[PDB]
């Protein structure tokens, strides 16, 4: 059921297992557990030790260089909850340099309430890709798991498949198992956080992780909100006060703790807002008799004496030590060398402070984007200043964009100078607004706020250029914008025009093809584009190019990004057009959509035409030998400085000349295809070639705008009996035993007829064959024979076409005179 045993506040284990045995009689850890610095150990030393009583840890679990430990499935076989009340460098579970360790084996951990997990430098660790952290951590992107065996090598992972559930992580499913014999337990989505039983039923609402019997507060292993007398409750009822955000205690416990802290060396506990907390917040003071902090009749802030007067903030746990502070008796150095935005936690812990006795310094915060998390920061006294008498030292902030919201936020800097350097995404406008609002306008000297380093990678020209005339055509775009001139017009070096295709709308500022334009003379500047890709939406905006100036704020001019789409045109020829002759009168067409649609393909055009048979074949005697009838980029870095220097030299010479000179005295069948990539043509002559003219054409009613067609040759299949000769064979015998054979030709054969075969044989003799070609057939009206021996003969007739050889006719009997 619920937690038995004592509470065993968090402890530390070092150099031997002798002090590790004190975890046997407790199930909940009210603190942080660290097992670390274990060198004189062996793998057999751990198999004899196991702690199944442990259930959940309030703060975190840290493992650092514990030799001989291979898996945690025996040490902590019932751990399920890591609350993360106090973290270890914004990490709730750290596994660092765990040599001789192969797998985690924490097969009962379900939810980590707060924090993240960092696992690093374990050359023998596997089963890291076989675990789903999304089911446990709210923010899975905050994990940092590198330098293991799963990336430097290819160690095998064997999740039992014959049962481990598979879950998609990026785009594919894979089984989730803690070890080779422990599938990762997964609950149904209806059981969002309360957990499921063995058969998968949602537990009680006040339940978390796992439960014995569903829908029962008293049959759970981890109370989600609070624990009290073996029962999980929404809040502690009276007279019980919330304690450590995880359990409810009476007044006696808090009183005993407070008295013991007073009567010893500390967390002198008090009571406020129905909770026993160590120190009550600003404006309250604990009474003598009772422990409740009555509000004070005056402005008493909660001071936080910073040791050494200079505290470095680099992690969630380091920022948490300032929780509830209002007056900071020292200086803050904000330095998060991260890569993930910790703004939420920073605003949760900080932001309740009002004044800083010393200075504020923000250095190398790669992840910071805005200092708005200082919600209630107003005064910076600057009694202790950074070296060089500085009260706000911002340096090398890679992604800092805004300091505050000056429309609402107020600030006050008493003493000390400003400092800004290498904030590439922070613009000078914000810095000057801060100078004006704070009241430190006349305090900074030259080079205190750098100009060539701040905002160099931010597009904040704060001056608008408006396009006055934009025109679009087939493949070129004509642009025009209003002229711009700095106070010294010779400073204008021209314009930069940036264009890039934009399939979607939201496009960033500042690929991105660069073209230069000469400045105008003294007729808007304008520019004409060359060779655009038709039917495409582009992004256009003009950025000025002007000489740098050291004396003051530099200059500025740029145009807001616009979107323009070039028109449509004729599409390309359809790709891969093929034809198959499935039937004797049917042809099927297949083709692909054009590679360059150049718009929207509204329809297709298919054209049909018959090609007459080759008259050359009709005029050949194919009975001769040889009758094999056919069977059918950027810009150099030095160059730009070169033209800058040349222009500056010209300006300098002009200025010198003016100084020296002036002195101040005192038809074919077809059809229309509608969104079909294939076609079937009917009503075609058998075994006849057809040429297919195929067009992809994207405009029908307002005239066709579409290019040339694809030409292919398709020949229909031949009829089976087209070459079969119809009509009885007629034989004629003259006085001199001269035989002439007559028959009716196949008037509609597969294409044409080249020759005929006549085979005449006497009864019992050998078969004699004869060929009659087209010219012979026309001249003799069939077959003519000379000098026949007496007897009974059988004559067989067949035809030859382009398809092949025709069937023979029924033999006919005839006999000649013997004289």
């Amino acid at each position: 059921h619920l937690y038995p045993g004592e509470v065993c506040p968090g402890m530390d284990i070092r150099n031997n297992l002798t002090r590790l045995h004190e975890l046997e009689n407790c199930s909940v850890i009210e603190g942080h557990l660290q097992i670390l610095l274990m060198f004189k150990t062996r793998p057999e030393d751990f198999r004899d030790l196991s702690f199944p009583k442990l259930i959940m840890i309030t703060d975190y679990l840290l493992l650092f260089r514990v030799y001989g430990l291979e898996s945690l499935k025996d040490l902590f076989p019932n751990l399920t909850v890591i609350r993360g009340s106090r973290l270890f460098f914004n990490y709730a579970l750290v596994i660092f340099e765990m040599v001789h360790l192969k797998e985690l084996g924490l097969y009962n951990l379900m939810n980590i309430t707060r924090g993240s997990v960092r696992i690093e430098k374990n050359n023998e660790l596997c089963y890291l890709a076989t675990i789903d952290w999304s089911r446990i951590l709210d923010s899975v992107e905050d994990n940092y798991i590198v330098l293991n065996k799963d990336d430097n090598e290819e160690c095998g992972d064997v999740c039992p498949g014959t049962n481990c559930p598979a879950t998609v992580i990026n785009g594919q499913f894979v089984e989730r198992c803690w070890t080779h014999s422990h599938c990762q337990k997964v609950c149904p989505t209806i059981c969002k956080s309360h957990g499921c039983t063995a058969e998968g039923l949602c537990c009680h609402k006040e339940c978390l992780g796992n439960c014995s019997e569903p829908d029962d507060p008293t049959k759970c292993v981890a109370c989600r909100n609070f624990y009290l007398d073996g029962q999980c409750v929404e809040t502690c009822p009276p007279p019980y006060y919330h304690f450590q955000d995880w359990r409810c205690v009476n007044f006696s416990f808090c009183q005993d703790l407070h008295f013991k802290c007073r009567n010893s060396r500390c967390h002198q506990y008090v009571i406020h807002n129905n909770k026993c907390i160590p120190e009550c917040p600003s404006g309250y003071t604990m009474n003598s008799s009772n422990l409740m902090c009555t509000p004070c009749l005056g402005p008493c802030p909660k001071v936080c004496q910073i040791l050494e007067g200079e505290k470095t903030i680099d992690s969630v746990t380091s920022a948490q030590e300032l929780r509830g502070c209002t007056v900071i008796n020292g200086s803050l150095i904000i330095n998060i060398r991260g890569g993930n935005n910790l703004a939420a936690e920073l605003e949760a812990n900080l932001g309740l402070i009002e004044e800083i006795s010393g200075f504020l310094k923000i250095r190398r915060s790669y992840a910071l984007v805005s200092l708005s998390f200082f919600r209630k920061l107003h005064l910076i006294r600057g009694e202790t200043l950074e070296i060089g008498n500085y009260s706000f030292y911002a340096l090398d902030n890679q992604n800092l964009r805004q300091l505050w919201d000056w429309s609402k936020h107020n600030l006050t800097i008493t003493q000390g100078k400003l400092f800004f350097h290498y904030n590439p995404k922070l613009c000078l406008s914000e810095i000057h607004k801060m100078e004006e609002v704070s009241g430190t306008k006349g305090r900074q000297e030259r080079n205190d706020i750098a100009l060539k380093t701040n905002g160099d990678q931010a597009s904040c020209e704060n001056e608008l250029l408006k396009f006055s005339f934009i025109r679009t055509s087939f493949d070129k775009i004509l642009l025009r914008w209003e002229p711009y001139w700095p106070p010294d017009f010779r400073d204008l070096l021209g314009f930069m025009l940036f264009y890039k295709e934009a399939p979607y709308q939201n496009v960033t500022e500042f690929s991105w093809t660069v073209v230069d334009i000469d400045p105008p003379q003294r007729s808007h500047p304008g520019w004409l584009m060359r060779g655009l890709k038709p039917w495409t939406q582009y992004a256009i905006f003009v950025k000025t190019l002007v000489t740098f100036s050291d004396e003051r704020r530099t200059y500025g001019a740029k145009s807001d990004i616009i979107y323009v789409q070039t028109d449509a045109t004729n599409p390309s020829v359809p790709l891969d057009p093929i034809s198959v002759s499935n039937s004797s009168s049917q042809i099927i067409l297949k083709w692909k959509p054009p590679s360059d649609p150049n718009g929207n393909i509204t329809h297709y055009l298919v054209y049909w035409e018959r090609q007459a048979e080759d008259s050359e074949l009709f005029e050949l005697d194919y009975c001769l030998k040889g009758l094999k009838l056919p069977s059918r980029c950027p810009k150099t870095d030095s160059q730009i400085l070169k033209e800058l220097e040349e222009s500056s030299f010209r300006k300098t010479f002009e200025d010198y000349l003016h100084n020296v000179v002036f002195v101040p005295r005192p038809h074919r069948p077809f059809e229309k295809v509608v969104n079909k990539e294939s076609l079937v043509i009917s009503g075609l002559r058998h075994f006849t070639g057809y040429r297919i003219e195929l067009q992809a054409c994207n405009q029908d009613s307002p005239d066709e705008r579409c290019s040339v067609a694809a030409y292919v040759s398709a020949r229909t299949m031949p009829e089976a009996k087209a070459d079969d000769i119809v009509g009885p064979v007629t034989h004629e015998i003259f006085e001199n035993n001269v035989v002439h054979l007559m028959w009716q030709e196949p008037k509609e054969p597969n294409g044409l007829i080249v020759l005929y075969e006549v085979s005449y044989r006497r009864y019992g003799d050998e078969e004699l064959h004869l060929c009659v070609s087209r010219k012979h057939f026309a001249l003799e009206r069939g077959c003519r024979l000379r000098g026949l021996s007496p007897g009974n003969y059988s004559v067989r007739v067949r035809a030859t076409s382009l398809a092949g050889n025709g069937s023979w006719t029924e033999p006919t009997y005839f006999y000649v005179t013997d004289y």
Binding site: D488, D655, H658, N659, F662, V663, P664, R665
Partner: peptide, 21 residues
């Protein structure tokens, strides 16, 4: 210099007579 008065600073009609007879 005249440029440091006119190109950088602002010149009024009055002092431009200093450069003329």
């Amino acid at each position: 210099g005249i440029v440091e008065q006119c190109c950088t600073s602002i010149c009024s009609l009055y002092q431009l007579e200093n450069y003329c007879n």
